[PDB]
Design a protein around this ligand. Structure first.
Ligand SMILES: CC(=O)N1c2ccc(-c3cc[nH]n3)cc2[C@H](Nc2ccccc2Cl)C[C@@H]1C
Length: 115
C-alpha cells in the first residue's frame, strides 16, 4: 500500500541512481551501465546461470516509467544486479571488485533514506 513518504523516498532513490551513473564512479560502474551482452562477451552460459538480468540502464528506464512504486522495489533491482555479478563471475574477477565498490556506494547512501 502506498505511503505518503513513497514520493520522497523515490526521490532519494533517483539521487542514488544518478550518482551511480555519474562520472565520479565511472571507473568501476561502467560494466553495469547496460545489459550483459552474453553472446558478444563469449559468455554463452550466462543466461543459463542468471534467471533475471539487471543493469543500471534498465533501472533508469524503470524509474523514468514510474515502474518502481517504492524504495524497496528499486533497491531489490540494484541488489539483483550485484547478486548476478557475484553469482556468475569468479570472486577474484576484476568485475567483482568493481561490483563491491559500487555496491558500497549504493548501500551507504541507501541507508541514509529519509523515513
Ligand atoms: C557486469 C558483469 O558481470 N560482467 C560484465 C558486463 C559488461 C562488460 C562489458 C561492457 C562493455 N565491455 N565489457 C563486462 C563484464 C565483465 N567483464 C569484465 C569487466 C571488467 C573488467 C574486465 C572484464 Cl573481462 C563480465 C561480466 C559478465
Amino acid at each position: 500500500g502506498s505511503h505518503m513518504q513513497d514520493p520522497e523516498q523515490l526521490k532519494h532513490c533517483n539521487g542514488i541512481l544518478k550518482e551511480l551513473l555519474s562520472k565520479k564512479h565511472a571507473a568501476y560502474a561502467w560494466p553495469f551501465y547496460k545489459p550483459v551482452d552474453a553472446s558478444a562477451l563469449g559468455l554463452h552460459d550466462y543466461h543459463d546461470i542468471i534467471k533475471h538480468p539487471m543493469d543500471l540502464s534498465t533501472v533508469k528506464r524503470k524509474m523514468e516509467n514510474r515502474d518502481y512504486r517504492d524504495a524497496q522495489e528499486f533497491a531489490a533491482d540494484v541488489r539483483l544486479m550485484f547478486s548476478n555479478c557475484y553469482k556468475y563471475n569468479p570472486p577474484d574477477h576484476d568485475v567483482v571488485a568493481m561490483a563491491r565498490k559500487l555496491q558500497d556506494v549504493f548501500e551507504f547512501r541507501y541507508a541514509k533514506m529519509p523515513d
